[PDB]
């Protein structure tokens, strides 16, 4: 019973399910290690397993999604690849730094420069760099993966809809997202709403009594319901099945 | 030795930002190095992400686009044509 703006229109019924991502700045910490060459390494080791892999997710989305999905990543693929993003953290490392902590600076560091930028044509990529940097973060570790988490059919639950997240889950099992902010016409936004895929925001709710519980979400209406009377629902179903299943059928509301 | 040429941006460097993200194909395509600079006289070297969000704050402003190679003109005409849509 919550009023949400409905950003793409469409109808979908699943549980609500937050992305397993989660600030791991938190993670930081100072000291000193001996391993400039295992370190430097090691991150080429992991860009190999973190550029491919994101190539790769980039080139399903391609085949599917939207071009323009691609033109973000593929941007982005490059970035990581681009030996400067790679010589500045074996850069830290010349001087003793670790690439668990080192890579985090470098990408705290370039945050930074990325917003400097005003046109938010672009300096909003921040945002996307951030994203890069999780996936750098679990790739540094062969003992941290998988797809995380792939579930059989729900809906995402984010404060901000995000790009890089949804190129973490897959579409198939994803069918709309409900965020409680991006909005206008975020990458992300823009994105999700020329894929045709249901998706609100305004939702002014936490995700902690969301867990796995009953979300549907209305975009032609841009509502959501919570485990409301079975009753209604039912009616629901004959309301549309009346005629004017188009328009928004004659309901409450200015009457 | 090198060829430029001065490209006045109308609040659009081209098409979005395929432009600048199809140059790094081109220059591994072609052979050359192409190098960007704004009026401010910042350079904003087709070979670093920061630059070329500095070149977006540039909608309005001119820019000196610089090429060296043999290809140096295929790059530059690229990219020129690019930015003339």
Known sequence: RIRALPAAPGVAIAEGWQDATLPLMEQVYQASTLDPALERERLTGALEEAANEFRRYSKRFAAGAQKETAAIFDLYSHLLSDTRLRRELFAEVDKGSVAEWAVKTVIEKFAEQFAALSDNYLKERAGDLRALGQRLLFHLDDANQGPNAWPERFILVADELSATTLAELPQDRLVGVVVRDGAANSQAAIMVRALGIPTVMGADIQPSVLHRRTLIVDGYRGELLVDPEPVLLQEYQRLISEEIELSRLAEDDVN | ?85
């Not at chain 2, 001065?6 to 052979?31: C, S, W, Y």
């Not at chain 2, 686009?65 to 690229?78: D, F, K, R, W, Y």
């Open chain 2, 1 to 85: 030795m090198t060829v430029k040429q001065t490209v006045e941006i109308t609040n659009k460097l081209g098409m979005h930002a395929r432009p600048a993200m199809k140059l790094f194909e081109l220059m591994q395509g072609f052979d050359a190095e192409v190098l960007l600079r704004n009026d401010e006289g910042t350079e904003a070297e087709a070979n670093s992400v920061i630059a070329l969000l500095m070149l977006d704050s540039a909608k309005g402003r001119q820019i000196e686009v610089e090429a060296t190679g043999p290809q140096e003109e295929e790059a530059l005409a690229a990219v020129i044509a690019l930015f003339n849509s």
